[PDB]
Design a protein around this ligand. Sequence first.
Ligand code: ADP
Ligand code: ALF
Ligand code: CA
Length: 890
Amino acid sequence: MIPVLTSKKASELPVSEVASILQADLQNGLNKCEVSHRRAFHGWNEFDISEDEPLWKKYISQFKNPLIMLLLASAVISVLMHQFDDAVSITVAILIVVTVAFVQEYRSEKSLEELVPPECHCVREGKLEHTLARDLVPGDTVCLSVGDRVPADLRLFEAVDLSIDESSLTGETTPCSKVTAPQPAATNGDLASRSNIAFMGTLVRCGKAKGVVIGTGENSEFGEVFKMMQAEEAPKTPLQKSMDLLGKQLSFYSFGIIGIIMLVGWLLGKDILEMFTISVSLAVAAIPEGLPIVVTVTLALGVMRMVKKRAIVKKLPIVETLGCCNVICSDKTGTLTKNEMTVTHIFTSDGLHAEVTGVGYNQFGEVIVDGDVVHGFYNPAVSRIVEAGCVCNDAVIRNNTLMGKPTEGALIALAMKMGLDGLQQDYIRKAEYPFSSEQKWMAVKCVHRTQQDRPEICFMKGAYEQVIKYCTTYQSKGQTLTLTQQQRDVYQQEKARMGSAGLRVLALASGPELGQLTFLGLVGIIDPPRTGVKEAVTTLIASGVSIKMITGDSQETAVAIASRLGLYSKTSQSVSGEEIDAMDVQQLSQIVPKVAVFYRASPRHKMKIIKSLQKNGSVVAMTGDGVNDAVALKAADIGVAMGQTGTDVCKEAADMILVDDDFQTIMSAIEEGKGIYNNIKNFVRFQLSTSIAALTLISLATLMNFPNPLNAMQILWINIIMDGPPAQSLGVEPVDKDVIRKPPRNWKDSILTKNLILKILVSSIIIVCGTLFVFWRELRDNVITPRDTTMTFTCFVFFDMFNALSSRSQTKSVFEIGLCSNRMFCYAVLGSIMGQLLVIYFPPLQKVFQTESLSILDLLFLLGLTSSVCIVAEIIKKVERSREKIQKHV
Ligand SMILES: Nc1ncnc2c1ncn2[C@@H]1O[C@H](COP(=O)(O)OP(=O)(O)O)[C@@H](O)[C@H]1O
Ligand code: ALF
Ligand SMILES: [Ca+2]
């Protein structure tokens, strides 16, 4: 059997011993059968899933709520009293309440169980595959590049200037350097001296590494520490504690009102038992005992609906601030535009204009100069630019797939169209200066493969303003002349003409050494934008949010794209990158609400901009994707990391990520969050309206005479129907398309507004008026009849049902939506109707409850009169929509 060795054993033993003991191939790797055997033997590369849930313990913990315990105490002291029906009814009712609370808790636990398995790169069968870190087995060959995180315990056998961040493991802010040499047995006392082992969960900052898996899952003390630190957390949502405070205030007000009405009923009154029972009923009915449950389940359904649309968001409280945003920055490449570059226009230093046809990275296409087809080395000016773009290239084309930068793949395809694919191997690359964000140029110094006696030739490419600083001469009609200022102005004007059409400009120069280069020409690398982003950005800035652009390119093409998709209003400015560099946050904070395009910028500037965006009243939505951009995401409130082109540093230490990079997904998530908030507001509105109506009805009933026709069991059933399946049906709801045009909700604003208060008060007074009308119409000279109680109970039930029906959406009436789209509402409605009809006619229940019989014409009159609240709500909604239309028409 293969033994599992610890970290110190792999540290003290050389690479040969750790390879022979583990039987791991450094170059070939392990086979599929051996990997499957090791996975079946040692298990999966995850923490031990040993967690049992005593569902019976949860069921009994659903008890002990003081109010239901006082209800059970009343029930048992009633058993002591010479009576049986009230006791058994109260016991069955409290049983239904406990089981509905338990199933609600189980559903909330399921929703809270409802982001991703972490992927990695592994070398198996001699090939590198992008596989799951969960299926990793001890002995696999793992490659770690910049950005990638260490999946499991790794024994380093190859390392190039590797620096790994271990602050999450030991707390040191300084990354330690890794080496492949074995450490002596004397220095293995502390953890910081272990520079030959890559531990699980560590973050690789820089460098490259190739190691062998030695420890997975449980076979690591650091793995145990991680399992115990990142398993039990409690990141409560600000909206959650806000709703908790609101519910506590409502409960305190309800308890005060109940104490007041009890003091009133005690004076000039008797039958203390019924008063205490009805007080307990009002206490269990008025208070919201399901607000956290419904808010959690609606947040979970919202996050599930938004991840269904390819939008993964961690840090659940972020869903609270999702949609509250008002400034959403974006980059040109990636989110706002697909990563596809195509060379279309070529401008040589001689003044020639060449057009390149064909779309895609293939050999299909031709170069036309003044009507003539240029192939091979027919035109010196064009062929020089082609060879300069080809010899200085890091991307490679294979089976129409590009490996590297797409901007270099564009020049690769351009050389392919001219039949110059085999030129890149004709030169021997000697010196390389790669393309960096600070220098913005890439240079290669090479010699010919068969003409090594010739002087070394260096080719530089990049931005015009950076390349032209190294150019001293130019070519015209085959003659090398000196670069005058007029030639520089002509080149700048041509760059402006190219940028005005939305083409990325790229300058190229060639020479014997750096500093005495001749400038060959410019190329127009067009970038087709994604389809559908135009209308999205149009409807985004039309109300609420404002989109920015951090491209890092020149101002010309940036403004061209921002005008094509639509970002530049008549009153808008644009700032450079050197302007942000030589300026503090205070002076910048006064020009940010006007600027919308950031050209010639860099991620190093982004953080600073964020500070300015944090100076005034606003919240940031960044879109960092590459390296050295995770700190900007952490400093901002939320950070949008891309899935395809995204490192692990900017993925795990970040916020909501977007797979299948696009721009409308943020808008969809914003609409989802706003719909969640609207559903929560509608549920709170319905609950508060029903509670206020019941409280004022009970008060007007027990005021000075004519005691309440609603008994304890009836009010408890009303509580069940107010906080049951028809209650949470309002929380979960498919959103319509109206909130994207609404202004964003401020963080200072609460969930209760003036119109909501007016609506709940109108609903309550209508309920009370209808109930009093029914009470007056049922009896004229009759003191007390059970038919009166039945009529009042069924009337209040039907009124609550119609009020819940009218409370489907605060911005949409019942006519626009149908009897679908969360049909669970209609399911709960029909279930409650069946339960009510069973309560009406059931001889075994007629002794339990108060209802014993009813008439058909009485039921018809009840359904005819109950629609008053519904018609009033629809009338006020129609007049509000008419006022909205007449105010937008002017
Ligand atoms: N491989 C490269 N060689 C030389 N110059 C480049 C290369 N790639 C990009 N550039 C230039 O450097 C600029 C900066 O690129 P980057 O900072 O990655 O932003 P973006 O790619 O979105 O423009 C580009 O606008 C382009 O002019
Ligand atoms: F892809 Al960029 F700045 F937009 F590096
Ligand atoms: Ca209640």
